Amino acid sequence: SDPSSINGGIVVAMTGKDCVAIACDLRLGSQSLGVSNKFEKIFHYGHVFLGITGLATDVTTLNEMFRYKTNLYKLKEERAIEPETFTQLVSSSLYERRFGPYFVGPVVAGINSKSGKPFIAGFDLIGCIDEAKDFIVSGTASDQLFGMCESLYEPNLEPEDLFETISQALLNAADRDALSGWGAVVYIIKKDEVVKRYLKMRQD
Amino acid sequence: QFNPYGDNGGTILGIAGEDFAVLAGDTRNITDYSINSRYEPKVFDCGDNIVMSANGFAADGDALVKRFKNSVKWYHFDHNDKKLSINSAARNIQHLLYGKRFFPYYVHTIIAGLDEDGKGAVYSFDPVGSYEREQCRAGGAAASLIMPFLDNQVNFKNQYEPGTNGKVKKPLKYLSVEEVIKLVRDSFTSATERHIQVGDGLEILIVTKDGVRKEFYELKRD
Amino acid sequence: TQQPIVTGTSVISMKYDNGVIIAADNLGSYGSLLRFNGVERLIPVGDNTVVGISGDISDMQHIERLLKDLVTENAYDNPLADAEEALEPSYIFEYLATVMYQRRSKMNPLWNAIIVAGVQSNGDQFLRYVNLLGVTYSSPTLATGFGAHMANPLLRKVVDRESDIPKTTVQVAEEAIVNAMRVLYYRDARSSRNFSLAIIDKNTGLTFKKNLQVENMKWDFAKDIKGYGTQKI
Amino acid sequence: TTTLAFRFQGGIIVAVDSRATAGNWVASQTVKKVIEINPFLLGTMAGGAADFQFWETWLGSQCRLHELREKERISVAAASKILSNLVYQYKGAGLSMGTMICGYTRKEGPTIYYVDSDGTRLKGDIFCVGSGQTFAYGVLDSNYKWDLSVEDALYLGKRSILAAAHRDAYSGGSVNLYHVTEDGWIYHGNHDVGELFWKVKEEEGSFNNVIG
Amino acid sequence: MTDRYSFSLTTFSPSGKLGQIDYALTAVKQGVTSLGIKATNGVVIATEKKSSSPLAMSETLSKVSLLTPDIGAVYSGMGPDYRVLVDKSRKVAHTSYKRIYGEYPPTKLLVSEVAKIMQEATQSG
Amino acid sequence: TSIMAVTFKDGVILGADSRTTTGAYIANRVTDKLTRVHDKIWCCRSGSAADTQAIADIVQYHLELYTSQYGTPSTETAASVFKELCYENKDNLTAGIIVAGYDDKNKGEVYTIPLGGSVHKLPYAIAGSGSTFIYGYCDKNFRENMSKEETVDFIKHSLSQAIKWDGSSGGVIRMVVLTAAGVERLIFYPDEYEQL
Amino acid sequence: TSIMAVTFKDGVILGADSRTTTGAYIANRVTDKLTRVHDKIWCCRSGSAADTQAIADIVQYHLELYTSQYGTPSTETAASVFKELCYENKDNLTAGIIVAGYDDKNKGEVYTIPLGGSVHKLPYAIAGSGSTFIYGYCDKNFRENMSKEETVDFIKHSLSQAIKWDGSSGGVIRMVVLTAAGVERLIFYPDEYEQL
Amino acid sequence: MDIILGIRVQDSVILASSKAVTRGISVLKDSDDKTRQLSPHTLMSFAGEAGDTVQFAEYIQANIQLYSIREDYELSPQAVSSFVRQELAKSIRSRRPYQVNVLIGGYDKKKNKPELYQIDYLGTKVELPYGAHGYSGFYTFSLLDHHYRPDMTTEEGLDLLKLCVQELEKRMPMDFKGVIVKIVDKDGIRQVDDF
Amino acid sequence: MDIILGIRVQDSVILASSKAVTRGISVLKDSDDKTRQLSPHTLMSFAGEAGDTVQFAEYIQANIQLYSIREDYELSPQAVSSFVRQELAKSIRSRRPYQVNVLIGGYDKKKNKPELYQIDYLGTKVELPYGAHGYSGFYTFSLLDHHYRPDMTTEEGLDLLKLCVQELEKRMPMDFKGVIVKIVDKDGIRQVDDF
Amino acid sequence: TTIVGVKFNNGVVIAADTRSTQGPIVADKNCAKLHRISPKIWCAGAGTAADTEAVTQLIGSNIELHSLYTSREPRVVSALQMLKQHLFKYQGHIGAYLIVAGVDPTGSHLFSIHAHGSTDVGYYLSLGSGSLAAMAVLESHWKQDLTKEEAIKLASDAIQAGIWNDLGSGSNVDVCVMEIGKDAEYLRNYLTPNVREEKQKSYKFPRGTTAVLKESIVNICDIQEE
Ligand SMILES: [Mg+2]
Ligand SMILES: [Mg+2]
Ligand SMILES: [Mg+2]
Ligand SMILES: [Mg+2]
Ligand SMILES: [Mg+2]
Numbered sequence A: 001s002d003p004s005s006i007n008g009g010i011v012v013a014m015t016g017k018d019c020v021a022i023a024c025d026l027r028l029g030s031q032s033l034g035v036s037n038k039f040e041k042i043f044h045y046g047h048v049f050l051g052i053t054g055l056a057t058d059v060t061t062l063n064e065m066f067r068y069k070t071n072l073y074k075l076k077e078e079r080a081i082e083p084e085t086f087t088q089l090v091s092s093s094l095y096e097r098r099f100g101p102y103f104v105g106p107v108v109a110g111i112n113s114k115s116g117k118p119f120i121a122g123f124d125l126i127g128c129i130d131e132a133k134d135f136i137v138s139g140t141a142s143d144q145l146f147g148m149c150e151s152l153y154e155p156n157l158e159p160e161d162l163f164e165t166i167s168q169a170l171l172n173a174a175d176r177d178a179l180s181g182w183g184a185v186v187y188i189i190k191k192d193e194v195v196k197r198y199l200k201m202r203q204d
Numbered sequence B: 001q002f003n004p005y006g007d008n009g010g011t012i013l014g015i016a017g018e019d020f021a022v023l024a025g026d027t028r029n030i031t032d033y034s035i036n037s038r039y040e041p042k043v044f045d046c047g048d049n050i051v052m053s054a055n056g057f058a059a060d061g062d063a064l065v066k067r068f069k070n071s072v073k074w075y076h077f078d079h080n081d082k083k084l085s086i087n088s089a090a091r092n093i094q095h096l097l098y099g100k101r102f103f104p105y106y107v108h109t110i111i112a113g114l115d116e117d118g119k120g121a122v123y124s125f126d127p128v129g130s131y132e133r134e135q136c137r138a139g140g141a142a143a144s145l146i147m148p149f150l151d152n153q154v155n156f157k158n159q160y161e162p163g164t165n166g167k168v169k170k171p172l173k174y175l176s177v178e179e180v181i182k183l184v185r186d187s188f189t190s191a192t193e194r195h196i197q198v199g200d201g202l203e204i205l206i207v208t209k210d211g212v213r214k215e216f217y218e219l220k221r222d
Numbered sequence C: 001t002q003q004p005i006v007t008g009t010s011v012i013s014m015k016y017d018n019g020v021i022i023a024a025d026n027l028g029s030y031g032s033l034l035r036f037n038g039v040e041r042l043i044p045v046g047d048n049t050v051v052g053i054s055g056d057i058s059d060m061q062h063i064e065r066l067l068k069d070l071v072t073e074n075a076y077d078n079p080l081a082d083a084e085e086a087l088e089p090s091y092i093f094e095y096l097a098t099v100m101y102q103r104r105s106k107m108n109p110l111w112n113a114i115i116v117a118g119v120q121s122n123g124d125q126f127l128r129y130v131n132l133l134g135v136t137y138s139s140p141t142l143a144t145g146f147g148a149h150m151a152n153p154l155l156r157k158v159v160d161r162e163s164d165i166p167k168t169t170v171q172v173a174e175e176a177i178v179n180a181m182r183v184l185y186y187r188d189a190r191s192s193r194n195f196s197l198a199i200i201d202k203n204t205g206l207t208f209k210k211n212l213q214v215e216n217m218k219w220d221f222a223k224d225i226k227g228y229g230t231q232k233i
Numbered sequence D: 001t002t003t004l005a006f007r008f009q010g011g012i013i014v015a016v017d018s019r020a021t022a023g024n025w026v027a028s029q030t031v032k033k034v035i036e037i038n039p040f041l042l043g044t045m046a047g048g049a050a051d052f053q054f055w056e057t058w059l060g061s062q063c064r065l066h067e068l069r070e071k072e073r074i075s076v077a078a079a080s081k082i083l084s085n086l087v088y089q090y091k092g093a094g095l096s097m098g099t100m101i102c103g104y105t106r107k108e109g110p111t112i113y114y115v116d117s118d119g120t121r122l123k124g125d126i127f128c129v130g131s132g133q134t135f136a137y138g139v140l141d142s143n144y145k146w147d148l149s150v151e152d153a154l155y156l157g158k159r160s161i162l163a164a165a166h167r168d169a170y171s172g173g174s175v176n177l178y179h180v181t182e183d184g185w186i187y188h189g190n191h192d193v194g195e196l197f198w199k200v201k202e203e204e205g206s207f208n209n210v211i212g
Numbered sequence E: 001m002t003d004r005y006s007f008s009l010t011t012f013s014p015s016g017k018l019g020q021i022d023y024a025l026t027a028v029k030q031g032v033t034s035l036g037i038k039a040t041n042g043v044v045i046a047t048e049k050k051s052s053s054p055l056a057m058s059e060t061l062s063k064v065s066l067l068t069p070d071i072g073a074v075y076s077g078m079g080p081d082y083r084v085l086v087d088k089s090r091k092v093a094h095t096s097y098k099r100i101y102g103e104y105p106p107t108k109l110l111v112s113e114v115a116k117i118m119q120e121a122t123q124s125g
Numbered sequence F, G: 001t002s003i004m005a006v007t008f009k010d011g012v013i014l015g016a017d018s019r020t021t022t023g024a025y026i027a028n029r030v031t032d033k034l035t036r037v038h039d040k041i042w043c044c045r046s047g048s049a050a051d052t053q054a055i056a057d058i059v060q061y062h063l064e065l066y067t068s069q070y071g072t073p074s075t076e077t078a079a080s081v082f083k084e085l086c087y088e089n090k091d092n093l094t095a096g097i098i099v100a101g102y103d104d105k106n107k108g109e110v111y112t113i114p115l116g117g118s119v120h121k122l123p124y125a126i127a128g129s130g131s132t133f134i135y136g137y138c139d140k141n142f143r144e145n146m147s148k149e150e151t152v153d154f155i156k157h158s159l160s161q162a163i164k165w166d167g168s169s170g171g172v173i174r175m176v177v178l179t180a181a182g183v184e185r186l187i188f189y190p191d192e193y194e195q196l
Numbered sequence H, I: 001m002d003i004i005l006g007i008r009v010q011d012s013v014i015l016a017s018s019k020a021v022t023r024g025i026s027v028l029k030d031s032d033d034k035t036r037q038l039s040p041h042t043l044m045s046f047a048g049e050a051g052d053t054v055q056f057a058e059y060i061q062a063n064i065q066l067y068s069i070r071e072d073y074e075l076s077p078q079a080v081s082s083f084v085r086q087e088l089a090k091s092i093r094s095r096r097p098y099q100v101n102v103l104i105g106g107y108d109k110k111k112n113k114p115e116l117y118q119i120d121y122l123g124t125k126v127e128l129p130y131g132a133h134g135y136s137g138f139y140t141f142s143l144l145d146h147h148y149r150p151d152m153t154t155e156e157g158l159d160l161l162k163l164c165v166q167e168l169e170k171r172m173p174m175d176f177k178g179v180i181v182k183i184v185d186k187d188g189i190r191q192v193d194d195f
Numbered sequence J: 001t002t003i004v005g006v007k008f009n010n011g012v013v014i015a016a017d018t019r020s021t022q023g024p025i026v027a028d029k030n031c032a033k034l035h036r037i038s039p040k041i042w043c044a045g046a047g048t049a050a051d052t053e054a055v056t057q058l059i060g061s062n063i064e065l066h067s068l069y070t071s072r073e074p075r076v077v078s079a080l081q082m083l084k085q086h087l088f089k090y091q092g093h094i095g096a097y098l099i100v101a102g103v104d105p106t107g108s109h110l111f112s113i114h115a116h117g118s119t120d121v122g123y124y125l126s127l128g129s130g131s132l133a134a135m136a137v138l139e140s141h142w143k144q145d146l147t148k149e150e151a152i153k154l155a156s157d158a159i160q161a162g163i164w165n166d167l168g169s170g171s172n173v174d175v176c177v178m179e180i181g182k183d184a185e186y187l188r189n190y191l192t193p194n195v196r197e198e199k200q201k202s203y204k205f206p207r208g209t210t211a212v213l214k215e216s217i218v219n220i221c222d223i224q225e226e
Helices: A056-076 A083-095 A142-152 A159-174 B058-078 B087-100 B145-152 B177-194 C057-075 C088-106 C144-158 C172-185 C220-224 D049-070 D076-089 D131-144 D150-167 D193-204 E019-030 E079-101 E107-120 F048-068 F074-089 F128-141 F148-165 G050-069 G075-088 G129-143 G148-166 H052-071 H077-092 H136-149 H154-171 I052-071 I077-092 I136-145 I155-173 J050-068 J075-091 J131-141 J148-165
Strands: A010-016 A019-025 A028-030 A033-036 A042-045 A048-054 A104-111 A119-123 A136-139 A182-192 A193-199 B012-018 B020-026 B029-031 B034-037 B043-045 B051-056 B107-114 B120-125 B130-136 B136-140 B199-208 B211-218 C004-009 C012-017 C020-025 C027-029 C033-034 C042-045 C050-058 C112-119 C125-131 C136-138 C141-143 C194-201 C206-212 D004-008 D011-016 D020-022 D025-028 D040-044 D098-105 D109-116 D121-124 D125-131 D174-182 D186-194 E034-038 E043-047 E065-068 E069-071 F004-007 F011-016 F020-021 F026-027 F032-036 F041-046 F096-103 F108-113 F120-122 F124-127 F173-179 F182-188 G003-007 G011-016 G020-021 G025-028 G035-036 G039-048 G095-104 G108-113 G120-122 G124-127 G171-179 G180-188 H004-008 H013-019 H021-023 H026-029 H037-040 H042-048 H099-107 H113-119 H125-127 H131-132 H179-185 H188-192 I004-008 I012-018 I022-025 I026-027 I035-039 I044-047 I100-106 I114-120 I125-127 I130-132 I180-183 I188-192 J003-008 J011-017 J020-022 J027-028 J035-039 J042-047 J097-103 J105-113 J118-123 J124-127 J173-180 J183-191 J212-218
Touching: A010 A048, A010 A104, A010 A119, A010 A142, A010 A159, A019 A042, A019 A048, A019 A119, A019 A159, A028 I188, A033 C125, A033 D150, A033 I155, A048 A056, A048 A083, A048 A136, A056 A083, A056 A104, A056 E107, A083 A104, A083 A119, A083 A142, A083 E079, A104 A136, A104 C020, A119 A136, A136 A142, A136 H037, A142 A159, A142 B177, A142 J027, A159 A182, A159 A193, A159 B145, A159 I012, A193 C012, A193 G003, B012 B051, B012 B120, B012 B145, B012 B177, B020 B043, B020 B107, B020 B120, B020 B177, B020 J118, B029 H125, B029 H179, B034 C136, B043 B199, B043 D125, B043 G120, B051 B058, B051 B136, B051 I004, B051 I022, B058 B087, B058 B107, B058 C136, B058 D049, B058 J124, B087 B107, B087 B120, B087 B130, B087 D049, B087 G095, B107 B199, B177 B199, B177 B211, B177 J027, B177 J124, C004 C057, C004 I136, C012 C112, C012 C125, C012 C144, C012 C172, C020 C042, C020 C112, C020 C125, C020 C172, C020 F074, C020 J050, C027 I012, C033 F148, C042 C194, C042 C206, C042 E079, C050 C088, C057 C088, C057 C112, C088 C112, C088 J118, C112 C194, C125 C141, C125 F108, C136 J118, C141 C144, C141 H188, C144 J131, C144 J148, C172 C194, C172 F026, C172 J131, C194 H037, D004 D040, D004 D098, D004 D131, D004 I026, D011 D040, D011 D098, D011 D109, D011 D150, D011 I100, D025 F032, D040 D049, D040 D076, D040 F128, D049 D076, D049 D098, D076 D098, D076 D109, D076 D121, D076 G011, D098 D174, D109 D125, D121 D125, D121 I026, D125 D131, D125 I077, D131 D150, D131 H136, D131 H154, D131 I026, D150 D174, D150 D193, D150 H136, D174 D193, D174 H131, D186 D193, D186 J027, D193 G039, E019 F020, E065 E079, E065 G020, E069 E079, E079 E107, E079 J050, F004 F041, F004 F096, F004 F128, F004 F148, F011 F032, F011 F096, F011 F108, F032 F048, F041 F074, F048 F096, F048 J075, F074 F096, F096 F124, F096 F173, F096 J105, F108 F124, F120 F124, F120 I044, F124 F128, F128 F148, F128 G108, F128 G129, F128 G148, F148 F173, F148 G129, F182 G148, F182 H021, G003 G039, G003 G095, G003 G108, G003 G148, G011 G035, G011 G039, G011 G095, G011 G108, G011 G148, G025 G120, G025 I155, G035 G050, G035 G171, G039 G050, G039 G075, G050 G075, G050 G095, G075 G095, G095 G124, G095 G171, G108 G124, G120 G124, G124 G129, G129 G148, G148 G171, H004 H042, H004 H099, H004 H113, H004 H154, H013 H099, H013 H113, H026 I155, H037 H052, H042 H077, H042 H179, H052 H077, H052 H099, H077 H113, H077 H125, H099 H179, H113 H131, H131 H136, H131 I188, H136 H154, H154 H179, I004 I044, I004 I100, I004 I114, I004 I136, I012 I100, I012 I114, I012 I155, I035 I052, I044 I077, I044 I180, I052 I077, I052 I100, I077 I100, I077 I114, I077 I125, I077 J118, I114 I130, I130 I136, I136 I155, J003 J042, J003 J097, J003 J105, J003 J131, J003 J148, J011 J042, J011 J097, J011 J148, J035 J050, J035 J097, J035 J183, J042 J075, J042 J173, J050 J075, J050 J097, J075 J097, J075 J105, J097 J124, J105 J124, J124 J131, J131 J148, J148 J173
Parallel strands: none
Antiparallel strands: A010 A019, A010 A136, A019 A182, A028 A033, A042 A048, A048 A104, A104 A119, A182 A193, A193 J212, B012 B020, B012 B136, B020 B199, B029 B034, B043 B051, B051 B107, B107 B120, B120 B130, B199 B211, C004 C027, C004 C050, C012 C020, C012 C141, C020 C194, C027 C033, C042 C050, C050 C112, C112 C125, C125 C136, C194 C206, D004 D011, D004 D125, D011 D174, D020 D025, D040 D098, D098 D109, D109 D121, D174 D186, E034 E043, E065 E069, F004 F011, F004 F124, F011 F173, F020 F026, F032 F041, F041 F096, F096 F108, F108 F120, F173 F182, G003 G011, G003 G124, G011 G171, G020 G025, G035 G039, G039 G095, G095 G108, G108 G120, G171 G180, H004 H013, H004 H131, H013 H179, H021 H026, H037 H042, H042 H099, H099 H113, H113 H125, H179 H188, I004 I012, I004 I130, I012 I180, I022 I026, I035 I044, I044 I100, I100 I114, I114 I125, I180 I188, J003 J011, J003 J124, J011 J173, J020 J027, J035 J042, J042 J097, J097 J105, J105 J118, J173 J183
């Protein structure tokens, strides 16, 4: 009934020293029924990364929409869109459907190509921006993620240390949620290299 | 229409050690967006080296703790001052709760102490009496924030040994009372940051063979 | 299950170094109608306890009779009824708290929020709350209804924790209570200017003050306020 | 929840999952869904957890009083009917129960009774109850034979829970195995689904869809 | 009533010339001189304030206009046409950019939007 | 809310309390419910604050545009514009407005427009939640062609009683006097009117 | 319904209208709402006619049995019996009763018992649907220790206004005077009180 | 309608779809083919609310057939599935949404690979080795999880499909009157007339 | 439960009752016998709400068995049916009514006649040549109206019963997993093990 | 949320807490609730967070265009009129509750705006879940002819009342001071009374603790030459 918890799933994003990290589980379900273990929730447009939780049909629709928009942005601007700018585009795009919204919990992550500054941001379904320094959480195990992130997180973590923190934050949160899990992916993002790691987790 | 139930917030946490047990709880009591009290004790010494907390609707919480304390007293009268073992206390509480199956005590009950072999014990109850011995249990408002952290840091879940890469799990080494208290405090500090109903003060009751000891710590008051 | 008809608003209270203060206005509202203006909502029990009641007045009057009946009963076969075996605040509260929770459990509550303020035999301050649900709690400051939202913040600036109680004199405490009552008169639409105040001190005993009024009010600034935005005249 | 129990040559196999959920929140992964009524009788948990714990603990008390009075082991038929008659008195009040009363006696042999909070009492050879029952039934139906060995029967029950634990969001945690003989039940351990899944995947070649 | 001119008033002549555009450029030629120079650390735009009368307050007539905090404009030709274009240029910088991306448009894209408005007056009915 | 408008010998006086409540919380204790739609045509607002403000603002616009074309409007005209908005949008409005004005030809006039959108020309009008408690008093104590001082006393005493009984009303008693002489604002504080 | 009881120098007077309505139909236009529970203890009835009649009948029984055992009851005692019934059966009653009586020791006394079942001793009391419109008037015009003629005029004028505004009230104004001298019934017709 | 299954094997996609059409109390038909050929190498099965299913299926069919003529070219299964998803995603926020779930089985002639897409009425697309809609998965997925291999032959796929149907026929309360099975491979679409 | 039929022929009563026990989404059992022997020559089949059916049937069984012992005598089918009707009629105005419909097939040894009684959960009794409960009659009664004769043999009755079951298996949406058939005659009660 | 506005001698000040919540969970512990409509017109919002942000940007945008069109600095009454007419049109469905404050050529102003489109004038105002706690402090200490330093003190004390006593409010105090004939000064995190204490333990994991299945380099760069 509740659109934001039919399909399930989670996204978490963190900042580190000269790096950001964004991660998601791989589950798509129809309530109790597990349907897919390969439903990735993180996308990227140039060097800007977008995680999206919530109703899966909207997750797909919005990804296609932001691909559409960032592609036209690039052609006209003659440059790739930045995280700060994209964040405002996501907000605009969501709020234009104020009284008929996409049931999603988006999460932006990236590094500004000019300033080198690590950036993350989150949104409610209606477009309100949450620009936190430390971390952003989203999905059906957001409470669990808030608890994991709050205790595990410390500032200025190196990329390889940050990987361990965000992974353990995601995994243990997903294990306390019926509608999350079935695999996980973690992106470690630096100014000019990005490493993608699939995590081994329990498959129930 | 009259609603006989309410939510007084609060969050509790029980952890069973090797030869000890702790039962902690914040001291904040609330309704809606108002604070009733910054220090309203929630975890209680019930005698016979048992500690108890009934988190949720405080009127049912107080009613139950009162009735259990009473049950301990009458157990002594009826059975020649025999000590009420933690497992016996747990079964007794089930009957108290299930007694009101069709108008429940709206509380999540946790008790802690030592079993008859002297090892640490924590029992966890639902509102209608289904109970179970556990090693680790957070209850109340910020339970969802604390439990995943405990799965990770007490039971070493999803943690493996470096070099083996997912082949060898981290061994389940025993935690000291000092080590547990650290994890309790950090659990409540984190919960206070991210949950509005958690704060003001933390009160921990530590149970050993020597008896019941108390420790109090300040929490953020916003 | 019922609905409250004739109602009483905020009861406010706090501890100070030698005792407790409690106050409540003299209004018995009938919905938005300010029906009864001479209602006493602080009811003393002996010389060491004052029970302040808000909510349904008919249920208050019932509770008033129970307490009156409690004093009578305590005196029966009790040579020390006015000495060692006199009613304590803690006895009076626990009795009410029992009744309130029992009544909510029969789905027929006394539609009230009660604050029992008093001083014990050993000179300890007693201040505890109980309501229609049977919920109880204690704190250096306690308030019902609107008082919870507006009075407590002000009273907590004086006594923010337990260690502030010995530092708070009766003059400072009474001042804060009287100021809080003024604030509630400004902002609570179901309040009146007339109120009663009670002090229970371990040295000077019970001082019950009737027919008090909210004074030193600020309204002059209202003359300058014109329109709702653009209007100048 | 996923619970199953089936009769075979070597007696009865009982197998359950270990998960407990309040909405999407996983309340516990270490729940005991097999009540040890007594050394010869077992019962399964589905629906209401307290209702199961309370009334089947109570059932054990009634069975003990029976054999004290009658100087004879209570039949599985009689033990099941005590529980079904009880819940039938409470019909309408809102008890939640779906259980298999499992036992092995001389006069009956291995016997399984499905008992329901609606008052249903059914004798049968194979039963599956819970949110993940349909997943377990599939594995059971296609692999079940009366002439299964105790070793193979135990594995079938374990594998059938695993099937449900994987697909059903509200099932998992770990698998508890029991084997009921005439001389009593025998516990066959707690098996973490996380470790079991990978073990089964490799050794059996199943779950090719999942990347390991 | 109704705008019954739903057809183009600018059309190709046999020689391939768009008359009205040429004639518009002729009107620009008659207009007062304005210029622009780009430096390494800035740009300058300038023009003469041709006062139509000494009684007129030439400070009230702004030939050089702010479009965004980082963009300015100056013109040559018909002043009224410039004034409305500045109004449209300011609004379009918000509606088709700032309200979407939360920042002011870059020079080239704002110029592109202005150009589009001017192109449409060259083809629309 | 307690509001009223009373005609007298020299013109008309509008009176109102200053309490605005959201449930039992007093959101604003110094509200100005006497609002100006023209130089000498004012109104008393009761009901939805959002609705009555929106209506008043529109009326003020209409009378400003009317004045630009046809000179000063009559009080009847202002009441008609109020009515037109209230009647035609009755399904989406909760507004009870008393219109009061001063012409030199017609002198003091009072029009009341209740929920429905109907118009009623009266010697005096009372409205708002607190008005119920003073129907008896106002009927017994109103006279036509009162003096300025008598009319101020009549309004002051009336609203004092409305405030006394109605929890939704309170604060200060604002008044606006409309005569040939001009526009005079009056304010009366609790300490003054409570002891009456 | 419009009802009231007023204490004065010589005792107390109860006053009431005579209209009883079923919706908008006047079922009885000459109702007697002033009812006797004892020689010099009467009451004014508002709310459910069935409930208030049943209550009054039970009270009358209780005071009759009280008198047989313990002699004449106090007005306070009669009010307590009314309260006991109204409070304990609040979930099933819609009754608003004013109790008025005359002792020689206590003289004129008035007790009001609203819906909840609470008791309020007052110098005078007003109740019923029509009472809302005369809170202002009655507060402004009541004095303590009035004469018999003044109190009759106060009640007559008050209920006249309540009748004027409240559609649920009307008919004749009945009154009952309770003094040391005895019990006097008074009636006042529309032609008399409407012109006031 | 009721049960629709799909399984992608080595070199083909197999779609099984029930034959029953039940209308309240009676089974009006026991030979209904719940599928449409969108293009020579792309088949779509469907199940959902009455009327909407066929209306939607035929609407998609026409649009793909139109594209095929215009460009003289067959769209890839992936392309067709994305088109179908958009139409359903468009539909869910409409005045009256299409209540239709589909499986798209196709053979990509460019990549020489079979492809199975599962799309529900909300526009929720997933590419799978095997799929289902409604309650069908609940009974069958445990069997498919166990037996399925990516290198299965078409004959082995049909045997696993029989085992799925048998389990459905045993444990489902509704009588779905058997299934029509169709195979999609490099040579096109054909129906297994004996099952 | 679902389908229960009854037919009175020349010298016997035949009761047919479905074997399925469905619990929500799954068919838990396909061999359930929805009948109880009340006395040697009286059989009662039943269908209705879960639990209530068996509880009621066994309660009636016990009461008739008690009467049989006390008086050393078998009650007539008519007498048993009247007792059963009263219990259901008593039940309908209870706190929680039995939701059970029954068919009572018996052979009266005194009159040497077979007798079939149809009683619903309200206590609505009717003696019939053939009967049913729920939706079963809707499909079968047109066939029974056509073919039935009062002088039919037991073999002819079983053939007409097969035709009724076949029509049910064709047009009913639910799979009731076939029927258990029992015959009640002068010699007592026996089960037709092949049907 | 706790937001307040206080008039003083030569201008107006607004203040706010820094806690944003989703139900009982704190999403952002340092949210910026003080928004800019124009350089010298600021506002604080409560209710639906997207609606407050969205409606201030829209009016802020239209105000900027209006300021350019009229060659005049923007007025608070214009922002007020535009906000209320917008909100009234949507009949409360845009859940924006604002305190608007600012200086312009007319003088210093302070208004409140409710979601249905009603507006109020005042010398001191409060909005949000901590408005009653804040208003208590304002009613206890407010006076006429406050200085700049007194108004900042009063405003932040009113926010503190909300922080401590209201569960919906917390963390830090943001302040913005708008004085006549001066630039408005935005004081981000004016007070910081809620810093988290150092934890008992570090939760930095040993490298290689997490189990990994696959690694791969992601291609963020464009299609390359040659
Ligand atoms: Mg999970
Ligand atoms: Mg907190
Ligand atoms: Mg699972
Ligand atoms: Mg008032
Ligand atoms: Mg409106």
